[PDB]
Amino acid sequence: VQRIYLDNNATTRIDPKVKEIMDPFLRDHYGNPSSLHQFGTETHPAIAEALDKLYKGINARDIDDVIITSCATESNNWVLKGVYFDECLKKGKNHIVTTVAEHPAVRSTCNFLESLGVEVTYLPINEHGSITAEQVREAITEKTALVSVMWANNETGLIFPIEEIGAICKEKGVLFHTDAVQAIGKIPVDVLKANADFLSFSAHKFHGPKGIGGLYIRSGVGLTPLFHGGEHMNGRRSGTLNVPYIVGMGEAMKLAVEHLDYEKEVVGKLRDKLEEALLKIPDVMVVGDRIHRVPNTTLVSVRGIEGEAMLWDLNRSNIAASTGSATAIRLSLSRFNTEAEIDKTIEVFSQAAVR
Amino acid sequence: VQRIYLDNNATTRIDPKVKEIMDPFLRDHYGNPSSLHQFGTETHPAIAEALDKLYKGINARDIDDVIITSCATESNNWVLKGVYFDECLKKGKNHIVTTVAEHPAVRSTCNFLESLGVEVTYLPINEHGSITAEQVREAITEKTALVSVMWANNETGLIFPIEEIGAICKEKGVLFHTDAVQAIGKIPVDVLKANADFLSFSAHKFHGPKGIGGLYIRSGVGLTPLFHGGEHMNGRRSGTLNVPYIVGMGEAMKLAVEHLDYEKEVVGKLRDKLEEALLKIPDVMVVGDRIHRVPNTTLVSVRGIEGEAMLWDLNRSNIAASTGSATAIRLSLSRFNTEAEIDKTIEVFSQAAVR
Ligand SMILES: Cc1ncc(COP(=O)(O)O)c([C@H]2N[C@@H](C(=O)O)CS2)c1O
Ligand SMILES: Cc1ncc(COP(=O)(O)O)c([C@H]2N[C@@H](C(=O)O)CS2)c1O
Ligand SMILES: [Cl-]
Numbered sequence: 001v002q003r004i005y006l007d008n009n010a011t012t013r014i015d016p017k018v019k020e021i022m023d024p025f026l027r028d029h030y031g032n033p034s035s036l037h038q039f040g041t042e043t044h045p046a047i048a049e050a051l052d053k054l055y056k057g058i059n060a061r062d063i064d065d066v067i068i069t070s071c072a073t074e075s076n077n078w079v080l081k082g083v084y085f086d087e088c089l090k091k092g093k094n095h096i097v098t099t100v101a102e103h104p105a106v107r108s109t110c111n112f113l114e115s116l117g118v119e120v121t122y123l124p125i126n127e128h129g130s131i132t133a134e135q136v137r138e139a140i141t142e143k144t145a146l147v148s149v150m151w152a153n154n155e156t157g158l159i160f161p162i163e164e165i166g167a168i169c170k171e172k173g174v175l176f177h178t179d180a181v182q183a184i185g186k187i188p189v190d191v192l193k194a195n196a197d198f199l200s201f202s203a204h205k206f207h208g209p210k211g212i213g214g215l216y217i218r219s220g221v222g223l224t225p226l227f228h229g230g231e232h233m234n235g236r237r238s239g240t241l242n243v244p245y246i247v248g249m250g251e252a253m254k255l256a257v258e259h260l261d262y263e264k265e266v267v268g269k270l271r272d273k274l275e276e277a278l279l280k281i282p283d284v285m286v287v288g289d290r291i292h293r294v295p296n297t298t299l300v301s302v303r304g305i306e307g308e309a310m311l312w313d314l315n316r317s318n319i320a321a322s323t324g325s326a327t328a329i330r331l332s333l334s335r336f337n338t339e340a341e342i343d344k345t346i347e348v349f350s351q352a353a354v355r
Numbered sequence: 356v357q358r359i360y361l362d363n364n365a366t367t368r369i370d371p372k373v374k375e376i377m378d379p380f381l382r383d384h385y386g387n388p389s390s391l392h393q394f395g396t397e398t399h400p401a402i403a404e405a406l407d408k409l410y411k412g413i414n415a416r417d418i419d420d421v422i423i424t425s426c427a428t429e430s431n432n433w434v435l436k437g438v439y440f441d442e443c444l445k446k447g448k449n450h451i452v453t454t455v456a457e458h459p460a461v462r463s464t465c466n467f468l469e470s471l472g473v474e475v476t477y478l479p480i481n482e483h484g485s486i487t488a489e490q491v492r493e494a495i496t497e498k499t500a501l502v503s504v505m506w507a508n509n510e511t512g513l514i515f516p517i518e519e520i521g522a523i524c525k526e527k528g529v530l531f532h533t534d535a536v537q538a539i540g541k542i543p544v545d546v547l548k549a550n551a552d553f554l555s556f557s558a559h560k561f562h563g564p565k566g567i568g569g570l571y572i573r574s575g576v577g578l579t580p581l582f583h584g585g586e587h588m589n590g591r592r593s594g595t596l597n598v599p600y601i602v603g604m605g606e607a608m609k610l611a612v613e614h615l616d617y618e619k620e621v622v623g624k625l626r627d628k629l630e631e632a633l634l635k636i637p638d639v640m641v642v643g644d645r646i647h648r649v650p651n652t653t654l655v656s657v658r659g660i661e662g663e664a665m666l667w668d669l670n671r672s673n674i675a676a677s678t679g680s681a682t683a684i685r686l687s688l689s690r691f692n693t694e695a696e697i698d699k700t701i702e703v704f705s706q707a708a709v710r
């Protein structure tokens with residue numbers, strides 16, 4: 001058999017170089033980087049280079065932290081629950097602005113924060129499929145502990161105006177967090193340019209293993225531990241280190257950024273090829289703006305047949321895709337798709353449509 | 356060179372069978388078990404068998420959960436912060452009993468809970484190196500939301516009387532949590548026998564990778580998510596699944612229990628051999644009871660030379676060991692140590708002592 005993966009926004013294949021680099025840490029360099037003897041110390045060089053790759057990736061500065069968590073979900077609950085005790089309870093600032101577009105790791109947590117008595121403004125999405133900096137300017141009250149905006153929508157692929165919100169945040173003296181999970185490796189990430197206080201990411205969406213992630217924390221921003229025990233990660237996030245995956249997420253980030261050109265040029269072109277080919281079949285129109293999107297995602301709607309049905313059929317022909325909201329069809333390429341595969345998908349998709 | 360690992364309470368070598376079993380999930384079966392197409396579904400059989408091994412390991416029942424977390428540290432912060440909003444704020448029960456022996460993942464979290472205004476009794480350790488069920492009976496107030504006792508001390512290897520505390524907990528209608536991280540694979544774990552509501556473990560202390568763990572939750576016990584977003588693990592712990600490690604921690608648990616005989620018979624004997632050999636050098640006495648210990652740990656004290664010094668020297672001769680508290684020397688075997696290695700260590704240790 002020969003299959004096509006087009007579900008890259010839902011997880012990605014670990015790059016073989018990432019697998020390769022992690023291996024020795026599943027074999028013989030199995031020591032706990034905390035122990036002072038030969039086994040922990042042996043891991044240090046590889047961990048620090050891994051970390052180096054991570055900072056370089058998002059243009060964090062030496063004086064910032066990039067903390068290894070177990071996923072973006074961890075990262076997200078940490079920023080929110082952390083600013084909860086820092087800013088909400090203990091500085092009175094009882095308001096958060098977020099969006100409705102956000103991943104449930106953000107929304108659901110907010111949901112519960114509201115149940116504790118926080119006020120949360122879920123900024124409403126407009127016709128463009130976007131959020132303007134102005135809306136955040138507006139809802140930004142004074143009780144505002146934190147702004148959270150995703151850098152890129154996981155369903156539509158839509159980029160938001162982070163840099164602007166970053167500025168509005170700076171001027172208004174409020175805390176800014178971006179969930180960047182869908183940006184890393186899709187489009188350049190610059191935290192400095194974004195004046196983000198906090199930035200989340202998950203390895204598996206850029207060819208790293210599932211079950212690791214990062215949170216970028218600024219210069220002198222504080223944030224109560226979500227994992228207390230203060231052993232690791234300069235007190236902020238306790239728990240024995242996931243060495244193999246740190247080393248891998250490191251490689252994975254490096255490679256992700258190194259292919260940024262590639263992603264926009266080749267992958268973006270493949271997504272344009274699929275997209276433009278597919279929309280030349282009756283009543284199938286793309287959801288959201290098409291200009292401020294990451295390269296790899298298209299979200300298409302086949303009016304009359306709900307998407308759940310397209311997926312089932314497509315699966316029988318060895319083509320993996322996912323659901324949207326609008327439900328529509330989420331095709332999401334990666335550096336490993338080929339034009340071969342796209343052509344094929346256009347063919348199989350169209351035939352599946354008509355029948 | 357030829358090295359000896361005796362630091363098994365600080366991390367362990369992944370068993371080669373565990374590495375082997377995880378591999379295909381780092382290669383080709385890279386899909387997100389949540390997606391409904393061929394890639395997510397493909398992971399289901401291996402995930403469910405992994406889970407099966409996990410329940411079987413700790414004798415959890417079908418109607419209980421065993422939730423995959425990213426480590427015991429995660430597990431521990433979850434039980435405590437979770438009963439905080441369930442029992443502390445929202446049922447008034449503003450008291451927790453724990454011990455002083457507990458891992459910082461427990462203590463440090465409690466510490467912060469106190470800073471929110473909770474009362475925590477840190478049960479004081481007696482001459483035996485233990486805690487009696489009676490003390491928990493005593494401090495168990497009425498405002499008592501939760502009892503937390505480790506099943507086995509990570510420094511001394513000392514087992515606690517879990518089954519009794521379990522009973523006291525049942526009679527007194529209070530919540531019981533055991534951090535079992537040092538029991539799995541050391542001594543039989545039975546949650547039913549322990550009447551624990553909650554049980555924590557970390558894979559890497561029984562030959563599974565670092566960065567995964569479990570929390571056992573009972574029948575109908577509730578516990579607010581520590582990771583909200585309610586996608587995964589029947590709402591309780593959100594975040595894309597760490598497939599490779601779930602599959603591995605599964606194998607690892609299976610193997611851990613299958614060697615329970617071995618651990619007590621052979622490894623326990625090796626630890627007795629080292630222990631009894633070492634204490635026949637002047638003013639070197641074992642810390643804590645010697646009878647209610649897991650098989651693999653000895654904690655020895657060389658009076659006159661602090662332990663930090665023994666470790667450095669020992670490291671130069673390729674023997675990895677860790678610190679205690681008393682600081683003493685924590686030698687911790689595993690199924691992979693050999694008598695060869697123990698003999699050698701007795702020799703090298705004694706020589707290092709005199710000089
Ligand atoms: C009783 C007990 N509970 C929780 C942990 C933490 O597991 P971890 O979150 O993977 O680091 C540990 C860790 N103990 C550490 C040690 O003994 O150095 C390494 S494993 C532990 O012993
Ligand atoms: C914006 C955004 N933030 C956080 C997550 C969660 O990362 P995860 O904790 O590893 O599952 C995701 C996940 N989105 C999921 C999806 O699109 O199905 C899989 S990755 C995300 O898109
Ligand atoms: Cl918290």
Ligand SMILES: [Cl-]
Nearest residue numbers: 436437580581
């Ligand atoms: Cl919580």
